[PDB]
């Protein structure tokens, strides 16, 4: 579908078995959703953006549903201050800007 | 043009006649570029990232170029960890997320 960026382009994503609302990012390498479980194995990794860095639980082949659409990444989990898909998942989904 | 995600949305813009590189960053509500100088008065806003708040100067009305496109708006200017182009001046040259 086509996005505008009039307003913050929130979509909802399956994930752990839960629903959540995302920011589709461009801007984002990483994708990073706020403290939840996750099944698997992770490790400790240190993200920055604006405001400086925030220690998060990585965890690769996680599956998830994007706007119907299925793909599985990395997915990082932390006290960020809203849930951010990165461009890591936006490739799978066929996600581009346009302009 | 179409822009896809395996790498950095990272383009060239201009202002204040100088050549600088930026993120296209949906997630992101505002536009801000690491220090520089900038025409007229500024006011004061605080933003909020991944990391935290930072303070930043706000100059309005400024001319910006982004991959050739011509926009006036909002830029901020503060400690950022890269110059980022939000949907401020995203939807000013037409962009849109599409997949
Ligand atoms: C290598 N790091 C990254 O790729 C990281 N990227 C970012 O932080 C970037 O993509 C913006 C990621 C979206 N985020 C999402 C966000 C939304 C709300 C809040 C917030 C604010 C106050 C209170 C509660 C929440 C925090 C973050 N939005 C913002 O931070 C913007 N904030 C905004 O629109 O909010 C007004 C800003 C104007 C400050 C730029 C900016 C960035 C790009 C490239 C290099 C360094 C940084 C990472 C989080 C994926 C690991």
């Given at each position: 579908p086509?996005?505008?960026?009039?307003?913050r382009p929130?979509?909802?994503?399956?994930?752990?078995?839960?629903?959540?609302?995302?920011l589709?990012?461009?801007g984002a390498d990483d994708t990073?959703?706020?403290?939840?479980?996750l099944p698997g194995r992770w490790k400790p990794k240190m993200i920055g953006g604006i405001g400086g860095?925030?220690?998060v639980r990585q965890?690769?082949?996680?599956?998830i549903e994007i706007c119907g659409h299925k793909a599985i990444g990395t997915?990082?989990?932390?006290?960020?201050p809203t849930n951010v898909i990165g461009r890591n998942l936006l490739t799978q989904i066929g996600c581009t800007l346009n302009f």
């Amino acid at each position: 579908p086509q996005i505008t960026l009039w307003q913050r382009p929130l979509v909802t994503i399956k994930i752990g078995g839960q629903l959540k609302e995302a920011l589709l990012d461009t801007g984002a390498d990483d994708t990073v959703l706020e403290e939840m479980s996750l099944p698997g194995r992770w490790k400790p990794k240190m993200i920055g953006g604006i405001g400086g860095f925030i220690k998060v639980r990585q965890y690769d082949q996680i599956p998830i549903e994007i706007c119907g659409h299925k793909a599985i990444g990395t997915v990082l989990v932390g006290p960020t201050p809203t849930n951010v898909i990165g461009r890591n998942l936006l490739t799978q989904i066929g996600c581009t800007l346009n302009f």
